[PDB]
Amino acid sequence: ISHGRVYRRLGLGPESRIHLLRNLLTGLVRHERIEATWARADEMRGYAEKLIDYGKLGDTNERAMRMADFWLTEKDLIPKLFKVLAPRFQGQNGNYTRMLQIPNRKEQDRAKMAVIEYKGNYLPPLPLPHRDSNLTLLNQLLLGLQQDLHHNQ
Amino acid sequence: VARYPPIVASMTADSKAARQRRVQRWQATVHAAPSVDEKIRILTKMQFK
Amino acid sequence: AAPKNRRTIEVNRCRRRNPQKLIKIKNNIDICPECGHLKQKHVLCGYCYEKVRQETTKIRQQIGAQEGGPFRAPSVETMVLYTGEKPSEKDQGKRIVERNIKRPSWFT
Amino acid sequence: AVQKMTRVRVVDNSALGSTPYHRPPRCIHVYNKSGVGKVGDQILLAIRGQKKKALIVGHRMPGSRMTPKFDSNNVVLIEDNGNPVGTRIKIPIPTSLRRREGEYSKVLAIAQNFV
Amino acid sequence: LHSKSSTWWDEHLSEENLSFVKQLVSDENKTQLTSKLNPLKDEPWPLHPWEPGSFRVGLIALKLGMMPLWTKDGQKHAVTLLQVQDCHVLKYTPKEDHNGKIAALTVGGKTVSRFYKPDSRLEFYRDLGLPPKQIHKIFHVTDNAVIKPGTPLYAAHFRPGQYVDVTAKTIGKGFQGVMKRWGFKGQPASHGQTKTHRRPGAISTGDIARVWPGTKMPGRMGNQNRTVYGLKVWRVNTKHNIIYVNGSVPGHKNCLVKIKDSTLPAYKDSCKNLPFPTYFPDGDEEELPEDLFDESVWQPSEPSITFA
Amino acid sequence: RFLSPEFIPPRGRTNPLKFKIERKDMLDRRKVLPIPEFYVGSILRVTTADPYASGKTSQFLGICIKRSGNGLGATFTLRNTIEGQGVEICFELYNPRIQEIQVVKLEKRLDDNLLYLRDALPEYSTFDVNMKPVPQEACQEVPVNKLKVKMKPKPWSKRWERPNFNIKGIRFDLALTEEQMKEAQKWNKPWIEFDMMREYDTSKIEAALWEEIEASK
RNA sequence: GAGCUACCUAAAAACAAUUUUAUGAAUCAACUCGUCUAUGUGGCAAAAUAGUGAGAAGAUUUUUAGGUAGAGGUGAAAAGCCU
Ligand SMILES: [Mg+2]
Ligand SMILES: [Mg+2]
Ligand SMILES: [Mg+2]
Ligand SMILES: [Mg+2]
Ligand SMILES: [Mg+2]
Ligand SMILES: [Mg+2]
Ligand SMILES: [Mg+2]
Ligand SMILES: [Mg+2]
Ligand SMILES: [Mg+2]
Ligand SMILES: [Mg+2]
Ligand SMILES: [Mg+2]
Ligand SMILES: [Mg+2]
Ligand SMILES: [Mg+2]
Ligand SMILES: [Mg+2]
Ligand SMILES: [Mg+2]
Ligand SMILES: [Mg+2]
Ligand SMILES: [Zn+2]
Numbered sequence A: 001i002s003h004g005r006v007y008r009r010l011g012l013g014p015e016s017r018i019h020l021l022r023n024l025l026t027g028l029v030r031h032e033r034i035e036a037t038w039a040r041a042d043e044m045r046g047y048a049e050k051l052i053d054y055g056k057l058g059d060t061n062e063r064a065m066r067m068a069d070f071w072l073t074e075k076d077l078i079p080k081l082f083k084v085l086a087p088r089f090q091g092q093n094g095n096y097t098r099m100l101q102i103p104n105r106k107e108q109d110r111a112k113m114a115v116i117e118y119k120g121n122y123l124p125p126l127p128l129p130h131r132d133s134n135l136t137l138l139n140q141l142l143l144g145l146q147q148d149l150h151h152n153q
Numbered sequence B: 001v002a003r004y005p006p007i008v009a010s011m012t013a014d015s016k017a018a019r020q021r022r023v024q025r026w027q028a029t030v031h032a033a034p035s036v037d038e039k040i041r042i043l044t045k046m047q048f049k
Numbered sequence C: 001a002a003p004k005n006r007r008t009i010e011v012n013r014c015r016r017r018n019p020q021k022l023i024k025i026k027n028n029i030d031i032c033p034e035c036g037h038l039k040q041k042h043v044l045c046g047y048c049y050e051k052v053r054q055e056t057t058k059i060r061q062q063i064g065a066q067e068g069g070p071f072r073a074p075s076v077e078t079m080v081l082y083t084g085e086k087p088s089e090k091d092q093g094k095r096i097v098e099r100n101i102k103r104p105s106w107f108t
Numbered sequence D: 001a002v003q004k005m006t007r008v009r010v011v012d013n014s015a016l017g018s019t020p021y022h023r024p025p026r027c028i029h030v031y032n033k034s035g036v037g038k039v040g041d042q043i044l045l046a047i048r049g050q051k052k053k054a055l056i057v058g059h060r061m062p063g064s065r066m067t068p069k070f071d072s073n074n075v076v077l078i079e080d081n082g083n084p085v086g087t088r089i090k091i092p093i094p095t096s097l098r099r100r101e102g103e104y105s106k107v108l109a110i111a112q113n114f115v
Numbered sequence E: 001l002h003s004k005s006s007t008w009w010d011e012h013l014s015e016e017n018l019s020f021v022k023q024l025v026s027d028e029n030k031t032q033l034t035s036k037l038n039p040l041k042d043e044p045w046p047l048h049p050w051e052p053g054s055f056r057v058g059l060i061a062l063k064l065g066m067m068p069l070w071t072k073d074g075q076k077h078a079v080t081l082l083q084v085q086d087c088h089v090l091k092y093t094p095k096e097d098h099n100g101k102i103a104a105l106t107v108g109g110k111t112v113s114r115f116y117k118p119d120s121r122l123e124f125y126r127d128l129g130l131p132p133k134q135i136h137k138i139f140h141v142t143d144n145a146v147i148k149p150g151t152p153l154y155a156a157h158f159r160p161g162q163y164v165d166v167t168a169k170t171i172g173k174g175f176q177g178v179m180k181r182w183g184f185k186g187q188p189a190s191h192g193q194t195k196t197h198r199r200p201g202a203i204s205t206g207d208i209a210r211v212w213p214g215t216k217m218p219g220r221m222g223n224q225n226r227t228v229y230g231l232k233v234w235r236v237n238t239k240h241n242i243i244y245v246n247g248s249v250p251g252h253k254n255c256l257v258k259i260k261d262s263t264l265p266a267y268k269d270s271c272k273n274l275p276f277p278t279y280f281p282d283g284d285e286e287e288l289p290e291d292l293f294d295e296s297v298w299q300p301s302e303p304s305i306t307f308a
Numbered sequence F: 001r002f003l004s005p006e007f008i009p010p011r012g013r014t015n016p017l018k019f020k021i022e023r024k025d026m027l028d029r030r031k032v033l034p035i036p037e038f039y040v041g042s043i044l045r046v047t048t049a050d051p052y053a054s055g056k057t058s059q060f061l062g063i064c065i066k067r068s069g070n071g072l073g074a075t076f077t078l079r080n081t082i083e084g085q086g087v088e089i090c091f092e093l094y095n096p097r098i099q100e101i102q103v104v105k106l107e108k109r110l111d112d113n114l115l116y117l118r119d120a121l122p123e124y125s126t127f128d129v130n131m132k133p134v135p136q137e138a139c140q141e142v143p144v145n146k147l148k149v150k151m152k153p154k155p156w157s158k159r160w161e162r163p164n165f166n167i168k169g170i171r172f173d174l175a176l177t178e179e180q181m182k183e184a185q186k187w188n189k190p191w192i193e194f195d196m197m198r199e200y201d202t203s204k205i206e207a208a209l210w211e212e213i214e215a216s217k
Numbered sequence G: 001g002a003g004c005u006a007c008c009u010a011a012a013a014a015c016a017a018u019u020u021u022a023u024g025a026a027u028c029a030a031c032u033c034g035u036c037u038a039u040g041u042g043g044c045a046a047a048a049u050a051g052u053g054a055g056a057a058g059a060u061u062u063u064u065a066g067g068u069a070g071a072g073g074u075g076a077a078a079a080g081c082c083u
Helices: A014-031 A038-057 A062-070 A078-088 A137-152 B016-031 B036-044 C009-016 C046-067 D105-110 E015-035 E119-128 E178-182 F016-032 F115-119 F178-187 F190-194 F203-216
Strands: A033-037 A097-100 A113-118 C029-031 C038-040 C078-082 C095-099 D026-030 D042-046 D051-058 D068-070 D074-077 E060-067 E079-084 E087-093 E103-111 E133-135 E138-141 E163-169 E174-176 E219-221 E225-237 E242-246 E256-261 E291-293 F043-049 F057-068 F075-082 F085-092 F098-105
Touching: A014 A033, A014 A038, A014 A078, A014 A113, A014 F190, A033 A038, A038 A062, A038 A078, A038 A097, A038 A113, A062 A078, A137 E015, B016 B036, C046 C095, D042 D074, E060 E103, E060 F016, E079 F016, E163 E242, E178 E219, F016 F203, F043 F075, F057 F085, F057 F115
Parallel strands: C078 C095
Antiparallel strands: A033 A113, A097 A113, C029 C038, D026 D042, D042 D051, D051 D074, D068 F085, E060 E079, E060 E256, E079 E242, E087 E103, E103 E133, E103 E138, E163 E225, E163 E256, E174 E219, E225 E242, E225 E291, F043 F057, F043 F098, F057 F075, F075 F085
């Protein structure tokens, strides 16, 4: 009975759900790497990317400026979003934020966690997953097949 | 010509900066008070130890 | 509604030892290549992740000291430099965070 | 959807019902297998301490596409023998009554307008 | 450790291999599909003539959605769109082994990925030489109308006019109350009804000291296989293999269905006029138009309907 | 470039192939019958054949109060009052028994819906049956009539004063006291206008559709 | 055992704005009360909560100390109260 309802139910209601995401987003737009429960971090991820879309539009656009105010509680971050975050992402058209699952919380609450960040941040690189090198047994065999097929092609 | 919002603390937030801005609001009423007797009343209407 | 009879330990032992109530074993545990501590395949390694976050706190603490105020976030790009490193020409006009320690291996 | 107790507008010229006084006539009975009565459905109407059969010519409920939805529930008073009580009907009457199963040609003759 | 491990196709593939593997599989599917594109030139089974009492095979189609349609009488008929996608006969059981009086054919459709299927299913499809299909279904087919396994099937199997029957799983609505599931009247909201508004009434009779089996009680609704009968075929789009079926068809949009010749008594012998085994475009007996319409249907681009 | 609203697909999980088929049928009809550009609030005259009558057509004139539907199911409702009796008819764009659609007056109104005219005075919805068409300038912006209607007594079919409707074409001040207006704002729901995931961006789709629509010509 | 409660003595306190007038009059807060419905029912509660209601310058409410004790006390009488 909640089929196609993209949104979650968080906070004390619809408005509260909007105000909790405004705080994670402002922390993200400020620190560029923020932690939260997997559910809430994933809920924001859509909102996080769309700010860059408005930032790309530019300062002059009235709609971008107005939106950047409701979604940035601290008012020292609107200049940053437009003048450093937006220039960085001009080349890209998507994939602004990187989300990964940090182990469960060691709090006695034991909630699922995730770390969300902005790509190209100055902070130390996250321990991302690494796929096996082409030299590994299985990988090397496939490469031999590719060479054979490329010759056949 | 980007009409950025002023970089000031929030009025209703529970923070020291937000508290200080609310204090300035109270002092504003004193500044714009028309008469001296009203000025004194606003200053001392609240009693603390 | 109240129980009409005491339930025997045999019936109780049938309900609480059912397969549906047991802990299902985890098959996705592995060994982190770098540190060797245990991790789930679809999750990051806490030991390695803790190193990154500990460095992040130190960098963020240094940033806080420099700014010295709530609304002092710089629009210009941020950058972190360690002892023995000097800003390049391409890095001109970028905020610099100074760290006493040497450049960590994971940090590039 | 005309049902029991509905106040209805007698769009006619009959002296008994067309005169503008007394409470709006209320529906007592709907001559359908279902309670809801739509355009072209007979209904029993109570007027001034009397029971008079009427005919629905329009209603406020949305209908099928290309059909006229009126802003008020309109009805026409019909004698027991089928002859309409009123001699004229000036407000437009929908033309679907012609092909609906039943006897409506008499009303169409009385109704000058057509929508 | 010395224990069972969990793995998937991507776990080991490297960056370069990841794209190559996702590309090599795509190349193989095209080649396999092309190999079966010519049924009649691949040792087809004998094509016996039609006689009274014959039952044909049926297709499995994807439910794209609905759209309006008009007839030359001016009436609008809500019609649904069903797309045939990679509908290939898979297996042919004989009369005796099938356990029925009639033989049975399996008709799969809607090719799917190969990376998340059990090894047994992949092996069966590899022998058949076709890409795996999302769903299997069984059609009761007389011996005369048998088709060789691996024969591709297309929307030309049907023609405008023929009444057809469609069956598929209904939309799953989850655990629901007695009111919504079975349309129970329920209890009034006011006048003193205390905590009883949507609950079932009296389960059963008191004296029997039990509840009759099959009683209507709260439970999961939907997600149950259901069939709709006597649905006319308004139009057939050869290019996109889309059949226009009157009214509503069970299932959600993009849900696979089982289209089949209607079993109603009036439609007992409607298969005679249509292709008896099936239509083979590779045969190229006749080149059909892109869109096939019924006589009553008002085709677009025709003059506006006038009720003279 | 005026793209008819029905062409733009609604979001969902439906495959594009369903829309492509519908557009092809729709474009074919447009060749036979031209659907003139019109917006909510324009006065239209529609000629449709009557199945009940024998070889006879009918015309209805009214202001277009609502545009709804997608694809071949697109519909529009045009309203008028005859002999003091208000009438509304919902018309299907591509119904094969429509002979002609005429835009008597091409104009736009402050609101995307004119349903509130039911609660307005009769004059604001009355239109002459035989009113002649006005000249139109293609190389112009569609005229935006900013008339604010006057309402009848307070009990309305809907609570138009409420923020959800967002009506900008009613003279609330004459009909409603300031205290009532403040009460309506308790249902404002201000957050909705600022959630970036409620926005359906059709920039690429509108560009893609226009080329294909123009390509058919 | 009258620190609850019925009653009384003494010493005290509270009552905005509005309209009447010159008041056991009116609208309505603080405050007092407890008509109705709903929830609760080992409850937040051994009588509450959410709404809705009655009075609100008076036979008014409240505070402090004291007095009346069981064959009794008190009672604008419900055989009501007296831990
Ligand atoms: Mg559901
Ligand atoms: Mg979901
Ligand atoms: Mg404080
Ligand atoms: Mg009910
Ligand atoms: Mg209830
Ligand atoms: Mg809708
Ligand atoms: Mg209503
Ligand atoms: Mg005392
Ligand atoms: Mg007393
Ligand atoms: Mg007073
Ligand atoms: Mg009392
Ligand atoms: Mg009162
Ligand atoms: Mg009184
Ligand atoms: Mg008084
Ligand atoms: Mg008594
Ligand atoms: Mg006691
Ligand atoms: Zn590790």
